[PDB]
């Protein structure tokens, strides 16, 4: 299959034409998405088969190949990126000031970036380029507003 | 059977569109990964 990094999307044929269920990032040969995009389910790439290593049902992250390889964090003071790959749209960059999610477990950045829901797991980058985290777990507001976390696995 | 399709590289764009506020919000997150708001 294709290994190249960078940011790909996620299809399936299972309903109505090609529908994209959601997004993941490719880095180190390893593929990475939200659990709810796929639901740990095995992955095509060309005639290539992708199985899963490693998910959390509680973090919503899942790898594929090998072990969780995304390890920056948001500095919690500077804007981000969130490199945004809607449905049958070009994948398009979204420059934004992360609030916090406030937690018994601590703090977490959050995006306040409204997309369809078959954006789930386009990445949130730095100003070097590194991934931070994945879109599209959180959280609708008193303004029916969608804020979503910036969701970070841990690398061993 | 999902399959996946490059969708562009991983790169900061300079003069991207900016938008988006900043709330602080009191969140909880339960069991199946489901986040709500604490209030
Ligand atoms: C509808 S979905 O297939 O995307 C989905 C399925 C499942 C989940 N799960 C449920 C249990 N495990 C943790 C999370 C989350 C999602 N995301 C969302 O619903 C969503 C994603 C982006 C943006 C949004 N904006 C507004 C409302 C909603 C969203």
Redesign the interface.
Same mark, same amino acid.
């Given at each position: 299959?294709?290994t190249?990094?960078? !940011?790909?999307?996620? %299809?399936?044929?299972?309903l109505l034409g090609s529908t994209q269920?959601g !997004?993941? !990032? %490719?880095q180190e040969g390893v593929?990475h998405t939200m659990?709810?995009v796929?639901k740990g389910?095995?992955?095509?790439?060309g005639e290539g088969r992708?199985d899963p290593y490693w998910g959390?049902?509680?973090?919503?992250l899942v790898s594929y190949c090998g072990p969780w390889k995304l390890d920056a964090a948001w500095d919690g003071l500077s804007?981000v990126?969130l490199?945004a !790959?809607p449905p049958g749209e070009?994948?398009?960059?979204?420059?934004?000031?992360?609030?916090?999610?406030?937690?018994?477990?601590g703090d977490i950045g959050?995006?306040?970036?409204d997309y369809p829901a078959g954006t789930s797991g386009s990445?949130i980058?730095?100003?070097?380029?590194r991934?931070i985290g994945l879109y599209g777990?959180?959280?609708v507001?008193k303004n029916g507003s969608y804020?979503s976390?910036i969701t970070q696995g841990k690398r061993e | 059977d999902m399959y996946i399709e490059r969708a562009g590289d991983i790169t900061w764009e300079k003069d991207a569109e900016v938008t988006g506020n900043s709330p602080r919000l009191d969140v909880a997150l339960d069991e199946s990964g489901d986040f709500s708001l604490v209030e």
């Open positions: 299959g294709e190249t990094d960078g !940011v790909y999307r996620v %299809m399936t044929r299972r269920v !997004v993941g !990032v %490719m593929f659990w709810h796929t389910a095995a992955l095509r790439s992708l959390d049902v509680k973090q919503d804007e990126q490199l !790959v070009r994948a398009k960059n979204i420059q934004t000031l992360p609030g916090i999610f406030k937690t018994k477990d959050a995006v306040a970036l990445p980058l730095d100003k070097c380029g991934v777990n959180g959280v507001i804020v976390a | -």
